[PDB]
Amino acid sequence: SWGYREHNGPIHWKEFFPIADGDQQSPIEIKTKEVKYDSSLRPLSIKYDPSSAKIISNSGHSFNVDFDDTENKSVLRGGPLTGSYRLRQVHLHWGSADDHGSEHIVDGVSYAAELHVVHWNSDKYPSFVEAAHEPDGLAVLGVFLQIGEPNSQLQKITDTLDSIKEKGKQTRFTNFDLLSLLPPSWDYWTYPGSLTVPPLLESVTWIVLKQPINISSQQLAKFRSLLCTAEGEAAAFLVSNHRPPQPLKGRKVRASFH
Ligand SMILES: Cc1cc(=O)[nH]c(SCC(=O)c2ccc(S(N)(=O)=O)c(Cl)c2)n1
Ligand SMILES: [Zn+2]
């Protein structure tokens, strides 16, 4: 099965999922002199209910905070989006070293990690599952992490990781104030792309915030202790789980600011 190890990592994914070589793949290099300022883009309209968070799990590929998306308590609107995108899931990407952990790269600068906040278009689709197969179905907010002072909201996640070390394990997790976790500035870049993991579907409107948030080196290192392997399998650690940048193939990256 797919992963980030030598045999099963990003270079080999095209072997099980050919769209890995598609024309709208993510992540990408963001080259700021090539981005087009677009005055029709709107500021982000963000509403996240801290009670929406319910469970945190180890998928084998990252941790997932899953949100109750039964109704429209936590939604993203504005930005490049038409209509209302419902919060589903938060997860993180990192690398084995603090200087190279993010998926999107900005003029060659990788960050220490990158948080993804995944939402789905419930104004057009009846479920996440249906939305995930259409070009306008998903919207992902990408937030960079840089090493700095410890982050008291991320401490809440790190404190759970010992209880979910094995692939498949879950624990309850709620009262998570995702709105306060975001950086001061919500200036962003946006482009049409894909999931950055298999099945790599080309259904995502990416919204990548320019300003990073801080995490300490000790908090970040805790994520690398997660196993990519299940209880009863030979242990291997998820030291790195970021996909390299993919060809832009003529897509327009736009900025909400200039
Ligand atoms: C978000 C979610 C909930 C769920 O129940 N199942 C799944 S399958 C994984 C998936 O669809 C997915 C994974 C990664 C991403 S990412 N790395 O943020 O481009 C996305 Cl948009 C979607 N994903
Ligand atoms: Zn992701």
Residue numbers in the entry: 4 to 261
Structure paper excerpt:
CAs are zinc metal containing enzymes that catalyze the reversible hydration of CO2 and dehydration of bicarbonate. CAs are involved in many physiological and pathological processes including pH and CO2 homeostasis, respiration and transport of bicarbonate and CO2 in various metabolizing tissues and lungs, electrolyte secretion, CO2 fixation and biosynthetic reactions, bone resorption, calcification and tumorigenicity. Analysis of previously published structures of compounds bound to several CA isoforms, together with four newly solved crystal structures of CA II with compounds 1d, 2c, 4c, and CA XIII with 4c, revealed that all compounds bound to CAs in a similar mode but with significant differences that may be correlated to differences in the thermodynamics of binding. All compounds bound to CA by making a coordination bond between the sulfonamide nitrogen and protein Zn atom.
There are three crystal structures of CA XIII with 4a, 4b, and 4c. The 4c structure shows the formation of one hydrogen bond with a water molecule while 4b – with three. This change may be the reason that causes the increase in the entropy as methyl and oxo groups are introduced in the pyrimidine ring. The compound binding affinities to CA XIII increase in the direction 2 → 1 and 2 → 3 → 4. The ΔbG change in the direction 3 → 4 (incorporation of chlorine) is relatively small, but the enthalpy becomes less favorable while the entropy – more favorable. Incorporation of oxo and methyl or dimethyl groups does not affect the binding affinity, but modification of tert-butyl in pyrimidine ring changes ΔbG to more negative by 5.8 kJ/mol.
